[PDB]
Amino acid sequence: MRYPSDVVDQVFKLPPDKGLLTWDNDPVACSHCARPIEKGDLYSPSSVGAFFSDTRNLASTSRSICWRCLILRKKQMLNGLSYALITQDGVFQISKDTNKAWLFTTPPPAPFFVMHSSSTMQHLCWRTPVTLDNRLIKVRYGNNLFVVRPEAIREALEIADRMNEGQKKWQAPIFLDRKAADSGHGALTKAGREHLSAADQEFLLNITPGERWALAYIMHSKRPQPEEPECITSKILEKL
């Protein structure tokens, strides 16, 4: 899998819609997934409407949308892929905290896309870049493009465990917000400020925003136990 639109024909196996124009000009990328639209490929002109708030994330100004993206842009597809992890095998739901911990500590090997909506409904799937290697996971949370490294997540979890192994009252070394919205997101808490060594503080201050967002779900007083998410592509196909 190479493009976000590749999930349609590879895990949803949906044939293209009808009434679609056929490109008969010089190739140009899809305005959504940057996929080339060569001669003979089925496309459709852009008709996003006045409620499209993702003009900044458009891959190109070609005003053309491939059929895979047209399938992806359906309301049933948007709602189904709000908290979805699309691997080669199928589509899983990472909405639960345990699923997030499993994904960010024991990721699947194959290429996969990670989606997470920050609101009721958002355009995600055609914006998420593919994660080619599980060591450098690219996560699209709403409008933010996050890079999550599972090794850094594990190291931060170990740092917290060493910090709070003895004290009965568990305290978060770093202030984290699940929405990545608080003005104190990523700042060191007091307990971590005078209970962590210089190296651990330096490591905590030098984590990517995506790692802070992930730890905002995985790092708590009682760490969630990782579990495999349930397959969802059947539900999405049935509702489509």
């Binding site: 996003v48 993702d54 190109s60 100004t61 005003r63 608080d182 003005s183």
Partner: protein, 329 residues
């Protein structure tokens, strides 16, 4: 072309910081759970590193007005004072897309993404107003790069510089203003005061009874009454600020529009607190590439005469079709 605008605030400036913060009656921010807590809306602060008693510089919160707020303030000044009246003089009418692009840079007029030719880019990035603030479906890069409002303070000397050491303040420049809301029904004192109410005394009695029942239920344990006591942090009045505006390659029209907005800028407020008259200020100095162009009657002089003539000519020949083309509608 650097613009240095020195601003002194007549009234406190209140740029609300996001988040839920609490204060006690003594003024302690985020008190321990033992004492009563009242909500607090702190002023916006930027963590800057400052030499606190020489030694090793440490990070301190510096109260500022965000750069986006002042970018939008300049845009609103331009539109309200020199652009919208100019368009009304021609009886110009703006579509929803053009209006959104002009007032917020929104792309809802044509979100599909429109390709801009090089001739079109030259034509539109040279627009007196739309060139400065880019955006829209084209998402052209604007020529304007405004900075935040940094106060002339001991902690901002690494941002502002040492050019304004005479106007610097050493102490903290924030304060907590306490606000209270009263239930008007609890302040009725006679049937004359309750005459204007449709239910008369019965409506007030029912209101007070329901208030008492709700208060007792909440004390023992939905809906919220009118009584409230809260606080919010504002930057004290009189503090001097330095505002820096820059342009990459301005035409005379764009600089003239900037100077017109600066002349008309004091009529607006900074940040929030419109109800309490927060953000009032007076321009004390406008510096155009190292020379002072500010007079008591506003930006004037021979050194800025070409910009004013150019912007006047651009305004006279201003048409809504330019806005429609920029919005790609």
């Amino acid at each position: 072309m650097q613009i240095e605008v020195l601003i002194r605030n007549i009234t406190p400036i209140f740029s609300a910081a996001p988040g839920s913060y609490y204060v006690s009656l003594d003024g302690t921010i985020n008190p321990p759970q033992g004492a009563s807590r009242f909500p607090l809306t702190r002023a916006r602060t930027m963590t800057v590193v400052a030499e606190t008693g020489d030694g090793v510089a440490k990070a301190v919160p510096l109260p500022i007005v965000p750069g986006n707020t002042m970018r939008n303030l300049l845009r609103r000044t331009m539109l309200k004072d020199v652009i919208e009246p100019a368009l009304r003089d021609k009886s110009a009418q703006l579509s929803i897309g053009a209006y959104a692009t002009a007032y917020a840079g929104n792309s809802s007029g044509n979100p599909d993404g429109v390709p801009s030719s090089f001739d079109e880019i030259v034509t539109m990035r040279a627009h007196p107003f739309l060139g400065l603030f880019g955006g829209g479906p084209r998402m052209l890069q604007g020529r304007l790069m405004v900075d935040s409002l940094y106060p002339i303070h001991q902690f901002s000397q690494r941002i502002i510089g040492s050019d304004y050491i005479n106007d610097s303040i050493k102490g903290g420049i924030t304060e907590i203003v306490w606000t209270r809301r009263n239930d008007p029904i609890l302040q009725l004192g006679s049937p004359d005061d309750a005459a204007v109410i449709e239910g008369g005394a019965q409506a007030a009695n029912d209101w007070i009874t329901s208030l008492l029942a709700t208060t007792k239920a909440k004390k023992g344990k939905n809906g919220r009454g009118l009584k409230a006591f809260n606080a919010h942090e504002v930057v004290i009045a009189g503090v001097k600020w330095l505002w820096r505006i820059n342009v990459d390659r301005p035409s005379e029209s764009q600089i003239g529009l900037i100077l017109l907005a600066l002349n008309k800028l004091a009529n607006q407020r900074i940040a929030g607190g419109h109800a309490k008259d927060y953000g009032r200020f007076v321009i004390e100095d406008v510096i155009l590439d190292g020379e002072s162009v500010w007079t008591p009657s506003g930006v004037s002089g021979q050194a800025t005469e070409q910009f004013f003539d150019a912007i006047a000519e651009a305004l006279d020949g201003m048409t809504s079709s330019e806005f429609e083309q920029f919005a790609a509608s």
